[PDB]
């Protein structure tokens, strides 16, 4: 099971939120930023990472990458200006994406 | 200002959710269905509808359509088999989208 932590270094404030928040679970989690497509975290397979456990990340519609973890997972998404997001679990390298504007 | 209400006629149960709440405001609303791209409701312009006020709907990262309303808006999304969603404000015609699986 895994949680999602959000670090706002982008001055996003109340524009940035996790739903549902506060859980370490298997269920999908959604990081939302007003004006952009939600980033979905979920257990959509198959496992491609080398670690025991995984979290798949979708940037809007599209599969962005997969994260791996051991023990109780914590995927931390760090936001910086320009829609930059760095996502890391502490296993393997952090991975970057950019928020997609809703048109 | 406007609210979103969801109606489960698809036996989704705990797999269907609305965020942040069913209350009225101008911020984005998000509807999630386990395993599918989330639906976003928000004021992404320009206004294409004939009504004074609008709510734009995105199916994942794609623009699905725009709803119009007068007075205090209520966008009601009704879910049926096959990930079929009918969305209406009671102004103009109801519009339809189909949920997309996250791959």
Automatic annotation (TrEMBL), chains A, B:
Pfam families for this protein: HA1 (PF18239)
Domain Hemagglutinin I positions: 15-74
Protein name: Haemagglutinin I
Organism this protein belongs to: Physarum polycephalum
């Amino acid at each position: 099971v895994w949680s999602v932590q959000i670090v706002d270094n982008a001055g996003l404030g109340a524009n940035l939120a996790l739903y549902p928040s506060g859980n370490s679970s298997t269920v999908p989690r959604y990081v939302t930023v007003t004006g952009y497509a939600p980033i979905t975290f979920s257990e959509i397979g198959p496992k491609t990472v080398h670690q025991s456990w995984y979290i798949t990340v979708h940037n809007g519609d599209d599969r962005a990458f997969q994260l791996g973890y051991e023990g109780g997972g914590v995927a931390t998404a760090t936001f910086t200006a320009g829609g930059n997001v760095s996502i890391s679990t502490g296993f393997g390298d952090a991975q970057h994406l950019t928020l997609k504007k809703l048109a």
